[PDB]
Amino acid sequence: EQYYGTGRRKEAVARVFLRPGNGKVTVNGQDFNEYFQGLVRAVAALEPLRAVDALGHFDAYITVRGGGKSGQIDAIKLGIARALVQYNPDYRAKLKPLGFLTRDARVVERKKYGKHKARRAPQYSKR
Amino acid sequence: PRSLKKGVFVDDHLLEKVLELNAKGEKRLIKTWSRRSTIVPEMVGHTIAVYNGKQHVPVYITENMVGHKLGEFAPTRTYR
Amino acid sequence: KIRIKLRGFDHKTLDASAQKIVEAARRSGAQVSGPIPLPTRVRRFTVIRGPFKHKDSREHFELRTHNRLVDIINPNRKTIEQLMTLDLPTGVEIEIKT
Amino acid sequence: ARKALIEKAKRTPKFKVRAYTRCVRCGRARSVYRFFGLCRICLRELAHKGQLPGVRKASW
Amino acid sequence: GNKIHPIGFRLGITRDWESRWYAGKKQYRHLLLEDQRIRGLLEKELYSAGLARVDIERAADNVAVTVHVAKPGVVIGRGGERIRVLREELAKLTGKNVALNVQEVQNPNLSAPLVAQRVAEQIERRFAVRRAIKQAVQRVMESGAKGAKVIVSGRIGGAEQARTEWAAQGRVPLHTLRANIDYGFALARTTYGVLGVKAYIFLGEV
Amino acid sequence: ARRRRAEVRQLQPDLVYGDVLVTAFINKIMRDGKKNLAARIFYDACKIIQEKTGQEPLKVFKQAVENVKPRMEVRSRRVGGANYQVPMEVSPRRQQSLALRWLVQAANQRPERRAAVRIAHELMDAAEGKGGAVKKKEDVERMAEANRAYAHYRW
Amino acid sequence: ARIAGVEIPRNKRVDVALTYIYGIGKARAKEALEKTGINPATRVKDLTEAEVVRLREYVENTWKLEGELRAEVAANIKRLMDIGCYRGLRHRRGLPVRGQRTRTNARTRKGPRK
Amino acid sequence: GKGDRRTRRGKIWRGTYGKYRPRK
RNA sequence: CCGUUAGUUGCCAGCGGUUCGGCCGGGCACUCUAACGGGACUGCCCGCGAAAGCGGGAGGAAGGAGGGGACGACGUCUGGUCAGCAUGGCCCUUACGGCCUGGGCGACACACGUGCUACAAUGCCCACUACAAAGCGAUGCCACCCGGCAACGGGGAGCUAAUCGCAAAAAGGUGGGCCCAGUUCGGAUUGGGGUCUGCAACCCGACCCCAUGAAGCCGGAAUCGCUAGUAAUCGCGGAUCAGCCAUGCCGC
């Protein structure tokens, strides 16, 4: 009667919560492609639905925000998937492949002894 | 002319002297120091020593050019 | 109802403090209100390691504030002495309000 | 040892315009913030020792 | 010509904040300020009994002050005279007196700093400095230790031309951030100028 | 690679065609990251496809591809007191990647005033057999090989 | 519309018009487009005199710019250049009045490389 | 650009609001 | 990557009030968060192998030393280190030392260094639209309304600082202006208004607005940065700080 799935990564938090319903999605407010403005980004928070089909039988409510659009969108995606985990806790040959596994670990790391872009040491000149 | 600013502000540092002394007339150059001023009114037509950094050149001010940030009325470098 | 703040340096000072106060005032107040932490605040600083010209020898460290907001309900008299004179740490201070 | 200029404290801003910053330890009025009031060095070095309260080395 | 500070190596590991206290914004600074006036006029007057370290603690308005040496005699003074002009004089630098906290240690062989001040002053007196580190080390680790790694730098007790010298017994992985060790350096009086010394005794760790 | 291939990282298909070719290509259109406007022009261009040309985007993308993707070309060898220009079978992997880029670029060359316009223009012309990109291709091609005698040298 | 310096505005709104005149354009087109009262959307190709005269007129006494811009610019720059001022000092040669530093980098006024 | 100073890019960079961005 | 402790931040995964902003109550598990220990020891299945260990596969939060930090061993260079502090010696002193009034280290025919912004329409212009982040704020950040072409000027509320002052994150989204010129680009320098730390701001400041708007339509021989969340690009804060030429450094 309820399946929660959390997806977050790179400082963007998309907490996805699904429960028996249809095909609506409250992005901590509005709906899917409403919030993902002309964002081809939309489709990102529904792949975990494509997983074992049907994008019209479940009520979608999400607490998502932070970093920004994309990051949060995807986070939303992996989350939905986890909701799938809850629902059918025997979905390997579907939830792993086009599946998921952990956040991501790849955020604009750090600048140290200069060079900003952590690699971008000031270029040379003409000697 | 020259007001514009009023009273002829001079950052006190140069205003105090400008005033009252403006009584017995002049005597010229009163080797100014805090040119941070925005010269003004009565300051029209007089002489003061503008610290060009290491010298006290004598400057004489005139009508339409009086009221403006003191500094830029006494140079401070030397190229070509 | 009493509010409190033990802002500390050491990550054992806030421990001895909140510990003695929430567990000992557990025979007095409303048994206390759990030493709610607070996102320990951080202040970083970097500086040249190779004295004089060397836009590269530096490195850094930091100073910060760890925060413990204990708190006890039911101003039940007795509490005032299961912490107010039965304390034990050293690297923080007794901030009490209501 | 720049003794003659250890006047930094008689303040006499005499026009705020003069009283100036400084490092309590190794003097150096160059880079002398506040909370520390030290030369990046007198500073960072004595800190190094550590008899400079809590503050601890960075990592991440 | 680098290698990080044998204490920074220690921080949250082996050895920490001698002056133990907190504060925060707009005050910690001066707080410590008076602290150095302290340790300074401190070690200054009493380098006498060859002190060794000063831990000025603050859990409240007082200023702990447990300094350490291994010379108790002249330390407290025949009876307790010493600790008197001392703890009293104290107020002089910012009032809020403190109980003059005298801490004496067990064996100057584990005390690298001290031994350094030692063979150092020796070199003052003027003599075989290489010998000096050789044996100084020798015993310093010897009378129990896990290694005595010592070094001396600048003006090799002679030669118009300055130089370096060193020697060690056992182990002293200054590296292994966690090595729990004791590090010290001594000033260098000799009319050569400043010719510093350093020695590090490895304090186990396993 | 100091000894190991250092693999060809794989891309997740299109977010409008579930296709690898799409994705790679849009990255090529792209810049400053702007996955957005990237995919954008990708699309509007696709609009040129369906509209300006009944025929489908799938078939046009593919045909343009078959056209611009290279085949045999040259690099030289400094093996015997000299470097001779020798040709070789322009590996698939690359063939793709760069006939790809290539296209995108020559497309950049194109006239119009709108990016989707360019993409269109060329992609179509290519699919067909008419244009800067693929033509430049033929060039690298037959051009390369002139150094035929050299070829047998092996790359 | 023929105004002052015959700054006729093509397929552009009013604002985009003035900006084409002496000391006009950005910031200038806004004030002009406001007074003359016209949709900045207009491409500019039919400005009926009936409406052009209104903005064209008032755009004389208090506006110049045009065969007058030099006035406040030529007369105002003549004073400081006649007195021991400073505003004109930077221009007393060929460097940058606004700033700047001199010695190195300042061909903008000095002229070409030498 | 960021030096256009006046309009968009201009204040964007200046860090200034004013005649091109109310204080909110 | 997982359970352990706990919940004024965060949940509702289950409501009830809903003022429906999580406003009120309530639930501590989930997201949050400091803290704890467990988690590939080439350990197991398949290759290879005398061995180390590399190679295939599943398991999953992930190995193949998880991506990122700190750690730079022996010497080289007599490298750098006069004015960082320390220092041996040397010289010094009515002064090579002290304070003050101004200049000046920001003088330019020129060369080279590191960055800024730029030639634009896969852009500029305008209006409306959609979300961090690690930091910062007391005599300080500064609430909304009044003066506001503008810089700013006032009243003035808050915190007392995961709840209060900084903050408007921008590129992204939708329509609207422009249709490819030296242009709405570009914004020099000289066109104007003001904001402000400071007395004073000539020289020797930051800023808003008025007029002016130059060179440039990706730059020779040549020379640079960068293995993936990285390259590129877009932003927020930070110490020095009554103003600051910070387009520089740092962190995100």
PDB file of C-alpha atoms (C1' of nucleotides) in Angstrom, chain F residues 9 29 31-32 34 36-37 40-41 108 113-115, chain I residues 121-123 171-173 179-180 228 231-234:
ATOM      1  CA  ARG F   9      33.557   5.067 -21.734  1.00  0.00           C
ATOM      2  CA  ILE F  29      26.399  19.975 -30.747  1.00  0.00           C
ATOM      3  CA  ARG F  31      28.924  23.498 -25.120  1.00  0.00           C
ATOM      4  CA  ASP F  32      29.580  24.806 -21.572  1.00  0.00           C
ATOM      5  CA  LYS F  34      24.275  23.108 -21.815  1.00  0.00           C
ATOM      6  CA  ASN F  36      19.716  21.737 -22.728  1.00  0.00           C
ATOM      7  CA  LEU F  37      20.065  23.938 -25.800  1.00  0.00           C
ATOM      8  CA  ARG F  40      17.424  21.586 -28.163  1.00  0.00           C
ATOM      9  CA  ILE F  41      18.986  22.305 -31.557  1.00  0.00           C
ATOM     10  CA  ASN F 108      28.733  24.615 -38.115  1.00  0.00           C
ATOM     11  CA  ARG F 113      21.196  31.849 -39.273  1.00  0.00           C
ATOM     12  CA  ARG F 114      19.875  29.144 -37.043  1.00  0.00           C
ATOM     13  CA  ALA F 115      21.741  26.228 -35.524  1.00  0.00           C
TER      14      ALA F 115
ATOM     15  C1'   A I 121      22.530  34.622 -32.328  1.00  0.00           C
ATOM     16  C1'   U I 122      23.679  27.145 -30.252  1.00  0.00           C
ATOM     17  C1'   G I 123      23.673  35.735 -29.288  1.00  0.00           C
ATOM     18  C1'   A I 171      23.172  29.265 -17.418  1.00  0.00           C
ATOM     19  C1'   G I 172      18.424  26.491 -17.353  1.00  0.00           C
ATOM     20  C1'   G I 173      12.239  27.726 -18.700  1.00  0.00           C
ATOM     21  C1'   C I 179      17.915  39.102 -38.332  1.00  0.00           C
ATOM     22  C1'   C I 180      23.196  39.240 -39.135  1.00  0.00           C
ATOM     23  C1'   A I 228      35.001  12.424 -16.336  1.00  0.00           C
ATOM     24  C1'   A I 231      37.509  20.168 -19.920  1.00  0.00           C
ATOM     25  C1'   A I 232      34.597  24.013 -20.639  1.00  0.00           C
ATOM     26  C1'   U I 233      31.065  27.184 -18.759  1.00  0.00           C
ATOM     27  C1'   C I 234      27.568  29.819 -14.464  1.00  0.00           C
TER      28        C I 234
END
